[PDB]
Amino acid sequence: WTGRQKARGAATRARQKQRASLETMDKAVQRFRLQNPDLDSEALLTLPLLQLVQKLQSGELSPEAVFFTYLGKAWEVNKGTNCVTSYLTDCETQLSQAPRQGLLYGVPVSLKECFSYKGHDSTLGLSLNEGMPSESDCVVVQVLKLQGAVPFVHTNVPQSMFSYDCSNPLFGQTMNPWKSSKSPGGSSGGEGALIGSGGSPLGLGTDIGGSIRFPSAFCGICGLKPTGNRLSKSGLKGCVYGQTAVQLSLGPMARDVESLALCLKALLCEHLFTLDPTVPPLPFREEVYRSSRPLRVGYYETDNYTMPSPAMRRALIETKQRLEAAGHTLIPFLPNNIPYALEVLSTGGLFSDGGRSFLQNFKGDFVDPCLGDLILILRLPSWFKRLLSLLLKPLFPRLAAFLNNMRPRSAEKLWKLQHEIEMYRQSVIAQWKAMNLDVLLTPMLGPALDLNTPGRATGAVSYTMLYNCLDFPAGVVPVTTVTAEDDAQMELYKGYFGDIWDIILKKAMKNSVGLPVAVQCVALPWQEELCLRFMREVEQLMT
Amino acid sequence: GRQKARGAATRARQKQRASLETMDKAVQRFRLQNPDLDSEALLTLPLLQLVQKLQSGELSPEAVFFTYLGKAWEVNKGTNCVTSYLTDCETQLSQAPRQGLLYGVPVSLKECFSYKGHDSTLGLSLNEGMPSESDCVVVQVLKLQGAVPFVHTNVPQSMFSYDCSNPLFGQTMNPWKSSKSPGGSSGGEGALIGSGGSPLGLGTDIGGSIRFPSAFCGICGLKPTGNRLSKSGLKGCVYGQTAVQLSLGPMARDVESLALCLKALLCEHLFTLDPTVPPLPFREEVYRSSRPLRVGYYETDNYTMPSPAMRRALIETKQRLEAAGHTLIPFLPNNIPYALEVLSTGGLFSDGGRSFLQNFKGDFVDPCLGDLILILRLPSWFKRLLSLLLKPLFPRLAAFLNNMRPRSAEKLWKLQHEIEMYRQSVIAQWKAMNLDVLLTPMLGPALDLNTPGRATGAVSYTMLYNCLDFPAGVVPVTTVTAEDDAQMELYKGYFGDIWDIILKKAMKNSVGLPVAVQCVALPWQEELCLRFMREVEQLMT
Numbered sequence A: 001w002t003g004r005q006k007a008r009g010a011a012t013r014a015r016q017k018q019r020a021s022l023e024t025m026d027k028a029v030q031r032f033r034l035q036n037p038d039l040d041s042e043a044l045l046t047l048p049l050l051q052l053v054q055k056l057q058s059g060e061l062s063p064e065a066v067f068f069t070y071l072g073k074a075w076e077v078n079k080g081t082n083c084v085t086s087y088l089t090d091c092e093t094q095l096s097q098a099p100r101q102g103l104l105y106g107v108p109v110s111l112k113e114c115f116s117y118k119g120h121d122s123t124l125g126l127s128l129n130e131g132m133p134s135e136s137d138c139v140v141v142q143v144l145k146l147q148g149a150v151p152f153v154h155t156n157v158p159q160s161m162f163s164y165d166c167s168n169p170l171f172g173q174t175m176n177p178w179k180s181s182k183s184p185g186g187s188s189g190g191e192g193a194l195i196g197s198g199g200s201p202l203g204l205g206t207d208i209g210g211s212i213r214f215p216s217a218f219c220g221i222c223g224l225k226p227t228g229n230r231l232s233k234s235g236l237k238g239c240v241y242g243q244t245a246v247q248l249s250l251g252p253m254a255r256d257v258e259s260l261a262l263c264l265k266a267l268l269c270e271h272l273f274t275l276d277p278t279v280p281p282l283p284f285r286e287e288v289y290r291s292s293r294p295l296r297v298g299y300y301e302t303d304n305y306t307m308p309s310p311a312m313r314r315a316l317i318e319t320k321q322r323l324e325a326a327g328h329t330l331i332p333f334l335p336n337n338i339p340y341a342l343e344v345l346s347t348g349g350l351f352s353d354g355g356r357s358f359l360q361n362f363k364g365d366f367v368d369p370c371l372g373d374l375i376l377i378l379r380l381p382s383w384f385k386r387l388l389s390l391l392l393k394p395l396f397p398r399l400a401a402f403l404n405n406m407r408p409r410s411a412e413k414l415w416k417l418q419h420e421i422e423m424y425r426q427s428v429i430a431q432w433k434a435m436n437l438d439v440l441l442t443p444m445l446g447p448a449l450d451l452n453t454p455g456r457a458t459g460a461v462s463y464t465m466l467y468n469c470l471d472f473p474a475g476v477v478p479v480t481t482v483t484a485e486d487d488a489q490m491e492l493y494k495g496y497f498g499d500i501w502d503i504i505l506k507k508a509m510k511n512s513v514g515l516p517v518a519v520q521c522v523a524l525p526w527q528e529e530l531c532l533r534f535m536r537e538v539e540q541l542m543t
Numbered sequence B: 001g002r003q004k005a006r007g008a009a010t011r012a013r014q015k016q017r018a019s020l021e022t023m024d025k026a027v028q029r030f031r032l033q034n035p036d037l038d039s040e041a042l043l044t045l046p047l048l049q050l051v052q053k054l055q056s057g058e059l060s061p062e063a064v065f066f067t068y069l070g071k072a073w074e075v076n077k078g079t080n081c082v083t084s085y086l087t088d089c090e091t092q093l094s095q096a097p098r099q100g101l102l103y104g105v106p107v108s109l110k111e112c113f114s115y116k117g118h119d120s121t122l123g124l125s126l127n128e129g130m131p132s133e134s135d136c137v138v139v140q141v142l143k144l145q146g147a148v149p150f151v152h153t154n155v156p157q158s159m160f161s162y163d164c165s166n167p168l169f170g171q172t173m174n175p176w177k178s179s180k181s182p183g184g185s186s187g188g189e190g191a192l193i194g195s196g197g198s199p200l201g202l203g204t205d206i207g208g209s210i211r212f213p214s215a216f217c218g219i220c221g222l223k224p225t226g227n228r229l230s231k232s233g234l235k236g237c238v239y240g241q242t243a244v245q246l247s248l249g250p251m252a253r254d255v256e257s258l259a260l261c262l263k264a265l266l267c268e269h270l271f272t273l274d275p276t277v278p279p280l281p282f283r284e285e286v287y288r289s290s291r292p293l294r295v296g297y298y299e300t301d302n303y304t305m306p307s308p309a310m311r312r313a314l315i316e317t318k319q320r321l322e323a324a325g326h327t328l329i330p331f332l333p334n335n336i337p338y339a340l341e342v343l344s345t346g347g348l349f350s351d352g353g354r355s356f357l358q359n360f361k362g363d364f365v366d367p368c369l370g371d372l373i374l375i376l377r378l379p380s381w382f383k384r385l386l387s388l389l390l391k392p393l394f395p396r397l398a399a400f401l402n403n404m405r406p407r408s409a410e411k412l413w414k415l416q417h418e419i420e421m422y423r424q425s426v427i428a429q430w431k432a433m434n435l436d437v438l439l440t441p442m443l444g445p446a447l448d449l450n451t452p453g454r455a456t457g458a459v460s461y462t463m464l465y466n467c468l469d470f471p472a473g474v475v476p477v478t479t480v481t482a483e484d485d486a487q488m489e490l491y492k493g494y495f496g497d498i499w500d501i502i503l504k505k506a507m508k509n510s511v512g513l514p515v516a517v518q519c520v521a522l523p524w525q526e527e528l529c530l531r532f533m534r535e536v537e538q539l540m541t
């Protein structure tokens, strides 16, 4: 498996598809703009989604108008960002079908590429998934459609969706719309760049280690990673199936938190619960989302794993003080044994099989630089990860731990690990209740890392991963931008470890003046309405 | 060395003896102060009327409690279903929140439901002298909901037989016939509730362990969707096996009681105490619906040949449902063999049984387990070899052996994904045929008293829905007539291997014993399921 002819073929074919898609969308927007030269696009594109939806519903704006305008903006912003991989087949026929009663009637929505769509590849940037169009829409696509929405594009993801950058050898590299040298985050990076530049009012990403939250934060939009099984993962393309220790979660990304709520409200209905009975039929509880009661807000300023950027620290402290000023009680709170949850529970849950199932997707394929040495490392034999870990342990403990916990195990040892994760979850919940929290405020990784560094700043996944591991709903909302003061203070940054993960992060978070910085909001499992209520408060008080 | 096991067996027996003495003394002290109390009238009150009268004040908690305690102690003489009397349930009696939906209701608990200060031995020696530090979550909510958990009921050793004997507390018997099994692993509950000793109990079910005892002892029980209720604080012997979900649920004399129990358990108390449970309240309107149902049905799973009594019970409830204006659709989940032999066995024994076998180190192995322990203990290469030797001759046994071997995490992921897809397969099937609900045979009548551990194939009617993680309930609908029992002679199974041979024999001499039918709905559809169970109940009772 060292021949690349197939991979090269797939790369050419994918590029011609994306070039063709982009042409197609160009022709359509020109045809439209000719017929509608008086349309005020800028007014329409800057409409918050709630107001867009109401005008759609009132009939004040036709779907054609909002669609081809957004399509227009998507094509335009894509020139600078390369976030659109495909234009979704007969979304224009869907445009004129969109159920008029649908809660998202006439709303264009962007999809991360793994959200399978009839007649389209979900390549994941992998060559073996090229030329394999899905035979039907995934469940959440079906409901979006049923609920009046118009999925219109597939947005780029990093190869295999297992980097928090966003390049792949098929469609290339997606860029942060705020600064071309920066990453848009990932794996939902296409979404981040698109929505964060005004090209889509609402998109859907996925998140198993922070992949909704990284791009949302890096690109200065909001996003929510619900409880794993709050929404249906049916029809989603991934590259490892049956790993249940760390739940893959999917969720909404959007310009305001109201949009996230609307999207959940829309998705959580009889259509979804019918199409996928394995999802618990938990309707969106608006009264909880709309509550304006005080909150007991747990907070931490650092997780003692990934030292926060000065920007993050300030962002956290500032939203803390504003929340306090708004009459909420802020309690110092840090989930126990984060190192354990990250180094053994998370890494071991994600790589229970040494990474072998994951590695299968790369046979014959190029490995994108933004994955870093991940593939090289997973490919190392079990005994050598062991040996290396023990040699590294006295010197570089985080790396030792990482190597040591990504080895193959028996089903017997997997059961043991899942049980530790199960109890770990219950340990943090006890902590939570003992402290009587409603909700939890935390740092979000930020600002945007430089453009090939996420795959080498491996430790920085800590702020988000922890809640994948706990399967707590966690969302992210921008609250500030990097001041020069914050940027200069990066020179005084030396992480908690001084290993190359810290060194690469240190470098990667420099030259970031003006970029958005976010804060993370966490609630207990099944409490996405509560979580959004908190996010809405944060958003309000910082915006 | 078995001296520890013998010690534990002595100590447990002392504790059970002492518990029983304690309960006797209390009932006597009560009866003296209440000689005029009509016990019989009280004991035969259905649970809904019991609760009303508790709530109205017409019956005091003391009255219903000590009466039921009395009946429990009495029926336990003939059945050996009570393991322990629960610490200051009497102090709990006088605390019971007056508002609680189960105010003053005595509740029996399978021994694995942890209770402060009590062993949850599971019949295992290593779990003796290990009192739980606190009540498990569903116990906490029962209590918060006004209920009064009063006893721990026996389970088979390790809870992995559908009989009910263990070397600590011995063997529990079917209250209808002492030579028959009460079912298991929730066999204590079956015996106790099925003889009148408890109005409402809780069991668990990973392979049919709520539904076996319920059906064998002629009561009703529900195994909801795995994560509909909190498993927090439950004692088991394998942790972190997530392929086949452990489910817990209610057992009781009528289906209304199962609904009341869910309604009571599914509330802010539970969702707070265990946020990992989806906060899905009990939807009454769905339970109470009296609209027609499209009812999928099958008479046989082509795996375990039904007893004549099962077939009759199934066909009769079918015809009654049709007469009641429900449409009955022939429907059999695809690839049951697959689901049982590879998915279920592999999910339950992903590790070759090694985690599970850890619990027996040093301990006696109860006969009602059969050769399970001996078999799991076989090396992986030999399970393989024996499998391909047996394959041409006894294919079920081959399949069983072949699928209970250790695997990599890698292969576990694969299996898990095959379970996910199989689940989706049966759901699409179900939806294709537009079913509201599914009617199924349930194993019955009760097997002879050491045969469940050797009739391993008969787990098929229940196991299937543990694998699918569908809510599945069982309701008693008839009793074995002399006709049924005689036709048992002409019974040969679908295979004629020793599992059919043992089952044929085990199900003989069963005249008058209750036979049940199984009601299944889609995931999270407990209240629909119950709605169907109520219909069945209604039309056969």
Ligand SMILES: *C(=O)N1CCC(Cc2cccc(Oc3ccc(C(F)(F)F)cn3)c2)CC1
Residues within 6 Å of the ligand: A161, A162, A163, A164, A186, A187, A206, A207, A208, A209, A210, A211, A212, A342, A343, A344, A346, A347, A350, A374, A398, A402, A458, A459, A461, A462, A465
């Ligand atoms: C989106 O959800 N994702 C998933 C997470 C990847 C980033 C990533 C790559 C490789 C391994 C892991 O898991 C991991 C990394 C570090 C640690 C540490 F904290 F160091 F212990 C634990 N687990 C994540 C981006 C795309």
Ligand SMILES: *C(=O)N1CCC(Cc2cccc(Oc3ccc(C(F)(F)F)cn3)c2)CC1
Residues within 6 Å of the ligand: B159, B160, B161, B162, B184, B185, B204, B205, B206, B207, B208, B209, B210, B340, B341, B342, B344, B345, B348, B372, B396, B400, B456, B457, B458, B459, B460, B463
């Ligand atoms: C209560 O829930 N339980 C769990 C199940 C046991 C019975 C039992 C013992 C040993 C193995 C299995 O699993 C099994 C057996 C047979 C088959 C077959 F049908 F043959 F494919 C599949 N799985 C169950 C009782 C108490």
Ligand SMILES: [Cl-]
Residues within 6 Å of the ligand: A229, A280, B227, B278
């Ligand atoms: Cl769930």
Ligand code: NA
Residues within 6 Å of the ligand: A339, A397, A398, A401
């Ligand atoms: Na460390």
Ligand code: NA
Residues within 6 Å of the ligand: A343, A400, A401, A402, A404, A405
């Ligand atoms: Na380690």
Ligand code: NA
Residues within 6 Å of the ligand: B337, B341, B395, B396, B399
């Ligand atoms: Na077979």
